[PDB]
Curated annotation (Swiss-Prot), chain A:
Its EC number is 3.4.21.81. The gene is sprB. Belongs to the peptidase S1 family. GO terms for cellular component: extracellular region. The active site is at 33 (charge relay system), 63 (charge relay system), 141 (charge relay system). Keywords: Disulfide bond, Hydrolase, Protease, Serine protease, Signal, Zymogen. Disulfide bonds join 14-34, 135-162. Has a primary specificity for large aliphatic or aromatic amino acids. This is Streptogrisin-B. GO terms for biological process: proteolysis. It is an enzyme of class 3 (hydrolase). GO terms for molecular function: serine-type endopeptidase activity. It comes from Streptomyces griseus. It catalyses: Hydrolysis of proteins with trypsin-like specificity. The chain holds residues 115 to 299 of 299 of the full protein. Monomer.
UniProtKB/Swiss-Prot annotation, chain B:
The record marks 13-14 as: Reactive bond 3 for chymotrypsin, elastase, proteases A and B, and subtilisin. Residues 1-51 form the Kazal-like domain. It is found in: Secreted. It comes from the Eukaryota. This is Ovomucoid. Coiled coil: none annotated. It comes from Meleagris gallopavo (Wild turkey). Avian ovomucoid consists of three homologous, tandem Kazal family inhibitory domains.
Length: 185, 51
C-alpha cells in the first residue's frame, strides 16, 4: 500500500498520506480529521485487511494524524503510487505540486499561498495551511501533496471540485514529521 | 442532518456519503449542505449512504 491509496476507519474513507518510520517502527500519516475518533484502520471496504491503529491525532488547529502499522505482511512502499519519495521539503509560492487521492486519483497544480487560515466551522479552524489551485473531493483527505520526489503536505480540504476546478488546502508535512519524530523513506 | 450553519467556504474531504433528492451521492455532510444552500433550499436528503 502506498501514498494516495484508500484507508477505511469505522466512520468512512480517507487516503494514506505517506509511509514513514522511526527506527524499525512503521507508521503512515494522514489527515487529523480522519484520525480524530478513529481507532482501527483497514485497507478495504469489507474491513477484512487490517492496517493498524491510530497513534496520534491533531485536529483542529493543525490537520495531521499518524497510524501505527500492526499488519506485518502488507507491503509498505515509500512511494506515492509508483512515484518514489526521498525527502520532505517546505512549500513555496509558485511551486509545482501534485496530489494523489483515493477518490480522484492524481491531479497537479501550484502553491498559491502559505500560512492560510481555513475555517471549517463549528470551531474547527486550522492554521498555517498551504493554499493551492489543485482540486480534491471527498475521500481524498489525508492523501499526499508532493513535488517530484519531495513530500510536501497532506490533503485537508477546500472548495470546488475536479470538474469545475477548485482550491485545496494542505497541512505542511514537515510539521507532522517533526511532531512525531518520524521520517519518510 | 441540519444545514442551518451553512454555507461554509470550505469542507474537509473525508468520505461519508449522503444521497440527495437529485439522485446525486454527496461525499459528506459539508458538501451536501453547501449544495442545499446553492439550491436555495430546494435540494433535500433522500437517505444516508450512496444513491
Amino acid at each position: 500500500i502506498s501514498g494516495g491509496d484508500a484507508i477505511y476507519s469505522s466512520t468512512g474513507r480517507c487516503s494514506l498520506g505517506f509511509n514513514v518510520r522511526s527506527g524499525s517502527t512503521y507508521y503512515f500519516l494522514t489527515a487529523g480529521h480522519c484520525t480524530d475518533g478513529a481507532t482501527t484502520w483497514w485497507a478495504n471496504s469489507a474491513r477484512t485487511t487490517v492496517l493498524g491503529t491510530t497513534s496520534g491525532s491533531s485536529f483542529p488547529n493543525n490537520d495531521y494524524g499518524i497510524v501505527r502499522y500492526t499488519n506485518t505482511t502488507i507491503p509498505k512502499d515509500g512511494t506515492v503510487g509508483g512515484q518514489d519519495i526521498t525527502s520532505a521539503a517546505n512549500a513555496t509560492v509558485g511551486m509545482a505540486v501534485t496530489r494523489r487521492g483515493s477518490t480522484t486519483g492524481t491531479h497537479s497544480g501550484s502553491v498559491t499561498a502559505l500560512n492560510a487560515t481555513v475555517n471549517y466551522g463549528g470551531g474547527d479552524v486550522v492554521y498555517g495551511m498551504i493554499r493551492t489551485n489543485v482540486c480534491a473531493e471527498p475521500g481524498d483527505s489525508g492523501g499526499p501533496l508532493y513535488s517530484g520526489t519531495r513530500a510536501i503536505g497532506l490533503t485537508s480540504g477546500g472548495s470546488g471540485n475536479c470538474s469545475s476546478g477548485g482550491t485545496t488546502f494542505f497541512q505542511p508535512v514537515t510539521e507532522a514529521l517533526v511532531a512525531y519524530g518520524v521520517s519518510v523513506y | 442532518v441540519d444545514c442551518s450553519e451553512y454555507p461554509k467556504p470550505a469542507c474537509t474531504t473525508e468520505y461519508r456519503p449522503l444521497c440527495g433528492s437529485d439522485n446525486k451521492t454527496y461525499g459528506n455532510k459539508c458538501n451536501f449542505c453547501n449544495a442545499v444552500v446553492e439550491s436555495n433550499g430546494t435540494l433535500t436528503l433522500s437517505h444516508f449512504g450512496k444513491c
